């Protein structure tokens, strides 16, 4: 599915960025939605710095953790929203980050596994919901909403 492939590219872009070697140049966003997701994720982490900073050097099983929560976070009432989608994806990205302050092959496979997991959850039970929102263009429009 083109919608599946577009979804997989978005998650690969963001999680790949999250997993990258510390101190290397930031890869340019591959699509508009990739740039929006990166910006939204950054704002979310700023707002909830203490919550996300706590998982930043997460030494445990990264895939297991996200796999245990992916369905409820997306599904549970009120239901799926773009806010939830960004939050779950941002959380997954946080688990993958490394760097000098944090430390104070494996990452590659984990990011691949998370791309596959999250794509499947989105294209699985919430596919209809995603299409009704206008797909990833809807996503981009949603978070570009002008502010006061």
């Amino acid at each position: 599915d083109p919608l599946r492939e577009r979804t997989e590219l978005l998650l690969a872009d963001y999680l790949g960025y999250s997993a990258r070697e510390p101190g290397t140049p930031e890869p340019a966003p591959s699509t508009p939605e990739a740039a929006v997701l990166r910006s939204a994720a950054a704002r979310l982490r700023q707002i909830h710095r203490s919550f996300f900073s706590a998982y930043l050097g997460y030494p445990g099983n990264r895939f297991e953790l996200v796999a245990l929560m992916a369905d409820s976070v997306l599904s549970d009432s009120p239901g799926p929203t773009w806010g939830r989608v960004v939050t779950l994806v941002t959380f997954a990205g946080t688990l993958l980050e490394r760097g000098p302050l944090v430390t104070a092959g494996d990452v590659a496979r984990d990011s691949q596994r998370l791309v596959a997991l999250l794509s499947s959850r989105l294209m699985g039970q919430h596919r209809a919901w995603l299409q009704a929102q206008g797909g990833w263009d809807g996503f981009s429009h949603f978070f570009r909403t002008p502010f006061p």
Partner: peptide, 24 residues
């Protein structure tokens, strides 16, 4: 089962974040 609690916070965080953009 710690996943149940973290999922809870991720859910709250996401719903709040969504509300900032919902509509405006």
């Amino acid at each position: 089962r710690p996943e149940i609690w973290i999922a809870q916070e991720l859910r709250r965080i996401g719903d709040e974040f969504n509300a900032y953009y919902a509509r405006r």
